[PDB]
Amino acid sequence: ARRPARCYRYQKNKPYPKSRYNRAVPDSKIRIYDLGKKKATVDEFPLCVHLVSNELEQLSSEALEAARICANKYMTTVSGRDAFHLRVRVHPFHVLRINKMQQGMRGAWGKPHGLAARVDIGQIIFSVRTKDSNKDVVVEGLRRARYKFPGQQKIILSKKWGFTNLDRPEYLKKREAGEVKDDGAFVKFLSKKGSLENNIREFPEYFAAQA
């Protein structure tokens, strides 16, 4: 009864979110978006590989969930549940309607039927962060997930430290200086702005010349 996804591939209509106006919509099939060792520190996982959209299209909550299960399964089986952090970078917020079918085309406003995430070209879909010594296995992970999606998607070796915002060496320069300090699984960076006082409170490690 789930209509073939072919029916909703393109972004033909304009964002129909769940809202006071909507309300009666079904739940998302994709519901966990951070699998693997997500607790891990930024320093632990330098390599970041991406699944990247080559199309302006729509991905279902279902094909997200399916593809989610697929990679995470591969990645843990071949490198363990703690070898990687899988983040789904895309949330299915767009409600899809259907004209269930007395009468025919008279007043044919659809009922919610399913959700899609609307995705750009170049838009990242999955991100994974590991240790470089896991590349091929991570890559294969995403490769197998690709099969679970319509559209063309590219997989890109990133230039960045993990899910961090700086390329590896830039992160390095900062980190091997004062600057970087640890958070949940991210990092707080030293600002040259704001109170001098509770700036040295945080980051005691900065405020030193050499080593």
Binding site: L196, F207, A208
Partner: protein, 296 residues
């Protein structure tokens, strides 16, 4: 302040600060808008306001107009001018409030031409009356009472001011029911009383009434009235003759002065603190990352 209180970015960032003169708790714009706006078909006709304001005991009377560049003082009389006319004491009181107003009426009605025509009531028996138009003559100078934030109470002295400008010769449209000695329970004004207040009957009568119930206080205050041997009775003529004197020469004298403007400007930057240079500031910060960081 307390931790849990403390204003975030968003609070402050979205904040619509009021008019300064409102944050200052000084100017009430709702009344202002309605005090000042003129009939659009009365073109550049200014709408003149009679500002009355009481300091902690100095009474201010100005006649103002408005200019998008900033209001314009026609003329100003302060009750601290009253020693000139023979009033050295009690310069916050109803009868001082009267005199000062009277002064401001005479002063401007002078500088306008209708000095001679429009004398108002020379008598002053506390009768209720605004100044009438001369049959074939210049209509009187018309002014509207800018009370400010004064609470309109019946007996209030903001209106003592009013009644002096009106007794002066100014047209200052007004009713009785806020003058001392208006009857709550009959639409009726005892003028035997409001006369008193104009001449300061309540103060004087307080004096005689303390002359022999308690002299500890009557010297604790009315200290002045003693030190200058002015026991009650005289007080009505004190003011009566100030009246006389005020009408006889409203012309305003400025302070003699001593020390030029230039000079006050000197011995004041003495006590004014200098804003700092951003070069200087970074030499405070770097200074501080030398101290608080480098392990003292």
């Amino acid at each position: 302040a307390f931790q849990k209180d403390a204003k975030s970015s968003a609070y402050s960032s979205r904040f619509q600060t009021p008019f300064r003169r409102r944050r200052e708790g000084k100017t009430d714009y709702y009344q202002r808008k309605r005090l000042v706006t003129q009939h659009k078909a009365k073109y550049n006709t200014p709408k003149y306001r009679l500002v009355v304001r009481f300091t902690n005991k100095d009474i201010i009377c100005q006649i103002i107009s408005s200019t998008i560049t900033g209001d314009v003082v026609l003329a100003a009389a302060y009750s601290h001018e009253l020693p000139r006319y023979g009033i050295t004491h009690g310069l916050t009181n109803w009868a001082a409030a009267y005199a000062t107003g009277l002064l401001i009426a005479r002063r401007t009605l002078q500088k306008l031409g209708l000095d001679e025509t429009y004398k108002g009531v020379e008598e002053v028996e506390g009768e209720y009356e605004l100044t009438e138009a001369v049959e074939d003559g210049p209509r009187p100078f018309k002014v509207f009472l800018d009370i400010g934030l004064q609470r309109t109470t019946t007996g209030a002295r903001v209106f003592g001011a009013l009644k002096g400008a009106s007794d002066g010769g100014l047209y200052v449209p007004h009713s009785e029911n806020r003058f001392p000695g208006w009857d709550f329970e009959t639409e009726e004004i005892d003028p035997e009383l409001l006369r008193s207040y104009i001449f300061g009957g309540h103060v004087s009568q307080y004096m005689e009434e303390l002359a022999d119930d308690d002299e500890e206080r009557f010297s604790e205050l009315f200290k002045g009235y003693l030190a200058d041997d002015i026991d009650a009775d005289s007080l009505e003529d004190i003011y009566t003759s100030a009246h006389e004197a005020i009408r006889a020469d409203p012309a305003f004298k400025p302070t003699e002065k001593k020390f030029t403007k230039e000079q006050y400007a000197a011995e004041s930057k003495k006590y004014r603190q200098t804003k700092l240079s951003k070069e200087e500031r970074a030499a405070r910060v770097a200074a501080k990352i030398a101290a608080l960081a480098g392990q003292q």
